[PDB]
Enzyme design. Structure first.
Site, PDB file in Angstrom:
ATOM      1  N   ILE A 282      -7.883  -0.236  10.629  1.00  0.00           N
ATOM      2  CA  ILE A 282      -9.036   0.678  10.548  1.00  0.00           C
ATOM      3  C   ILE A 282     -10.199   0.073   9.771  1.00  0.00           C
ATOM      4  CG2 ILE A 282      -7.692   2.817  10.945  1.00  0.00           C
ATOM      5  CD1 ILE A 282      -7.830   3.290   7.859  1.00  0.00           C
TER       6      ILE A 282
ATOM      7  N   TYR B 207       0.830  -1.230   0.000  1.00  0.00           N
ATOM      8  CA  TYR B 207       0.000   0.000   0.000  1.00  0.00           C
ATOM      9  C   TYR B 207       0.851   1.262   0.000  1.00  0.00           C
ATOM     10  CZ  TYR B 207       1.035   0.722   4.970  1.00  0.00           C
ATOM     11  OH  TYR B 207       1.693   0.862   6.177  1.00  0.00           O
TER      12      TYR B 207
ATOM     13  N   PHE C 107       1.921   9.757   3.739  1.00  0.00           N
ATOM     14  CA  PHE C 107       2.196   9.383   5.127  1.00  0.00           C
ATOM     15  C   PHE C 107       2.847   8.020   5.320  1.00  0.00           C
ATOM     16  CE2 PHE C 107      -2.474   8.567   4.760  1.00  0.00           C
ATOM     17  CZ  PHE C 107      -2.558   7.238   5.128  1.00  0.00           C
ATOM     18  N   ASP C 108       2.689   7.114   4.345  1.00  0.00           N
ATOM     19  CA  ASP C 108       3.360   5.811   4.455  1.00  0.00           C
ATOM     20  C   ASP C 108       3.341   5.018   3.167  1.00  0.00           C
ATOM     21  OD1 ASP C 108       4.873   3.929   5.870  1.00  0.00           O
ATOM     22  OD2 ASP C 108       3.173   3.014   6.867  1.00  0.00           O
TER      23      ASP C 108
ATOM     24  N   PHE D 252      -5.783   5.635  -0.018  1.00  0.00           N
ATOM     25  CA  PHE D 252      -4.842   4.527  -0.169  1.00  0.00           C
ATOM     26  C   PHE D 252      -4.899   3.919  -1.567  1.00  0.00           C
ATOM     27  CE2 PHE D 252      -5.702   4.512   4.422  1.00  0.00           C
ATOM     28  CZ  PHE D 252      -4.484   4.215   5.006  1.00  0.00           C
TER      29      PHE D 252
ATOM     30  N   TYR E 247      -9.348   7.251  11.437  1.00  0.00           N
ATOM     31  CA  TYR E 247      -8.866   7.628  12.792  1.00  0.00           C
ATOM     32  C   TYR E 247      -9.758   8.631  13.515  1.00  0.00           C
ATOM     33  CZ  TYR E 247      -4.691   5.076  11.393  1.00  0.00           C
ATOM     34  OH  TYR E 247      -3.807   4.094  10.973  1.00  0.00           O
TER      35      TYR E 247
HETATM   36  C1  0MC Z   1       0.556   7.264   9.639  1.00  0.00           C
HETATM   37  C2  0MC Z   1      -0.564   6.209   9.667  1.00  0.00           C
HETATM   38  C3  0MC Z   1      -0.172   4.866  10.348  1.00  0.00           C
HETATM   39  C4  0MC Z   1       0.657   5.033  11.644  1.00  0.00           C
HETATM   40  C5  0MC Z   1       0.830   3.666  12.351  1.00  0.00           C
HETATM   41  C6  0MC Z   1       1.510   2.623  11.433  1.00  0.00           C
HETATM   42  C7  0MC Z   1       0.768   2.466  10.088  1.00  0.00           C
HETATM   43  C8  0MC Z   1       0.494   3.826   9.387  1.00  0.00           C
HETATM   44  O1  0MC Z   1       1.740   4.320   8.913  1.00  0.00           O
HETATM   45  C9  0MC Z   1      -0.442   3.541   8.199  1.00  0.00           C
HETATM   46  O2  0MC Z   1      -0.081   3.669   7.033  1.00  0.00           O
HETATM   47  C10 0MC Z   1      -1.905   3.148   8.398  1.00  0.00           C
HETATM   48  O3  0MC Z   1      -2.713   4.083   8.554  1.00  0.00           O
HETATM   49  N1  0MC Z   1      -2.289   1.864   8.341  1.00  0.00           N
HETATM   50  C11 0MC Z   1      -1.284   0.733   8.119  1.00  0.00           C
HETATM   51  C12 0MC Z   1      -1.777  -0.188   6.988  1.00  0.00           C
HETATM   52  C13 0MC Z   1      -3.238  -0.647   7.251  1.00  0.00           C
HETATM   53  C14 0MC Z   1      -4.160   0.583   7.413  1.00  0.00           C
HETATM   54  C15 0MC Z   1      -3.701   1.525   8.544  1.00  0.00           C
HETATM   55  C16 0MC Z   1      -3.920   0.867   9.908  1.00  0.00           C
HETATM   56  O4  0MC Z   1      -4.999   0.361  10.197  1.00  0.00           O
HETATM   57  O5  0MC Z   1      -2.906   0.879  10.772  1.00  0.00           O
HETATM   58  C17 0MC Z   1      -3.108   0.316  12.097  1.00  0.00           C
HETATM   59  C18 0MC Z   1      -3.185   1.469  13.089  1.00  0.00           C
HETATM   60  C19 0MC Z   1      -3.724   0.964  14.465  1.00  0.00           C
HETATM   61  C20 0MC Z   1      -5.258   0.653  14.509  1.00  0.00           C
HETATM   62  C21 0MC Z   1      -5.740  -0.645  14.497  1.00  0.00           C
HETATM   63  C22 0MC Z   1      -7.117  -0.914  14.529  1.00  0.00           C
HETATM   64  C23 0MC Z   1      -8.019   0.165  14.585  1.00  0.00           C
HETATM   65  O6  0MC Z   1      -9.397   0.019  14.631  1.00  0.00           O
HETATM   66  C24 0MC Z   1      -9.892  -1.330  14.804  1.00  0.00           C
HETATM   67  C25 0MC Z   1      -7.543   1.471  14.587  1.00  0.00           C
HETATM   68  O7  0MC Z   1      -8.495   2.455  14.633  1.00  0.00           O
HETATM   69  C26 0MC Z   1      -8.083   3.838  14.757  1.00  0.00           C
HETATM   70  C27 0MC Z   1      -6.165   1.721  14.558  1.00  0.00           C
HETATM   71  C28 0MC Z   1      -1.966  -0.709  12.234  1.00  0.00           C
HETATM   72  C29 0MC Z   1      -0.628  -0.310  12.421  1.00  0.00           C
HETATM   73  C30 0MC Z   1       0.347  -1.306  12.532  1.00  0.00           C
HETATM   74  C31 0MC Z   1       0.006  -2.659  12.450  1.00  0.00           C
HETATM   75  C32 0MC Z   1      -1.335  -3.049  12.256  1.00  0.00           C
HETATM   76  O8  0MC Z   1      -1.795  -4.366  12.142  1.00  0.00           O
HETATM   77  C33 0MC Z   1      -0.831  -5.448  11.940  1.00  0.00           C
HETATM   78  C34 0MC Z   1      -0.149  -5.708  13.294  1.00  0.00           C
HETATM   79  O9  0MC Z   1      -0.755  -5.362  14.341  1.00  0.00           O
HETATM   80  O10 0MC Z   1       0.988  -6.233  13.277  1.00  0.00           O
HETATM   81  C35 0MC Z   1      -2.302  -2.054  12.166  1.00  0.00           C
END
Ligand code: 0MC
Length: 128
Positions: A75, A45, A55-56, A118, A101
């Site tokens: 998310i 992604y 952002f990533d 994304f 978020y």
């Molecule tokens: C700058 C945004 C973000 C910052 C934390 C690391 C990932 C990040 O850089 C990003 O690009 C992001 O926004 N992601 C990562 C790719 C999947 C979509 C999204 C994400 O869900 O990241 C989660 C952030 C934590 C989260 C989990 C569950 C939530 O609701 C049920 C939630 O709500 C606000 C927030 C994330 C980050 C790192 C690992 C994740 O899962 C795999 C693992 O746990 O090893 C998941």
């Protein structure tokens, strides 16, 4: 650009029909099967804010992002959107803050009330 086009021309894939998650298929994947709940999913992604700032990106790390689908590990927009994808598919996903978020954001990169864009490629999925 691509974020405007998914905003204006995307498919609402929410069960509520609230325009909270919009999708365009960019590269058509293989056959008909999509992943099921609990599958280990491998994706690449890139993500951008509505101000145009990246952002990533998993491509920049030379390894895929891996999670278990439909378990609240990511998310809401991602559990909803990835569940619609075929193996090999690339899509664009617009995520309103209620499916991302919210009012909290995610410090330091994601502000309050942020709509996210994304590009996602579904590499593989498998049951454990
Ligand atoms: C700058 C945004 C973000 C910052 C934390 C690391 C990932 C990040 O850089 C990003 O690009 C992001 O926004 N992601 C990562 C790719 C999947 C979509 C999204 C994400 O869900 O990241 C989660 C952030 C934590 C989260 C989990 C569950 C939530 O609701 C049920 C939630 O709500 C606000 C927030 C994330 C980050 C790192 C690992 C994740 O899962 C795999 C693992 O746990 O090893 C998941």
């Amino acid at each position: 650009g691509a974020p405007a086009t998914v905003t204006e021309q995307g498919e609402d894939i929410t069960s509520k029909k609230d325009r909270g998650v919009l999708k365009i298929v960019k590269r058509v994947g293989n056959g008909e099967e999509t992943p099921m709940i609990g599958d280990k999913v491998y994706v690449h992604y890139k993500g951008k804010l509505s101000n145009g700032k990246k952002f990533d990106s998993s491509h920049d790390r030379n390894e895929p992002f891996v999670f278990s689908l439909g378990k609240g590990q990511v998310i809401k927009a991602w559990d909803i959107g990835v569940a619609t994808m075929k193996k090999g598919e690339i899509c664009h996903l617009l995520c309103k803050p209620e499916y991302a978020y919210g009012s909290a954001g995610s410090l330091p990169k994601i502000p309050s009330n942020a709509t996210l864009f994304f590009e996602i490629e579904l590499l593989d999925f498998k049951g454990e």
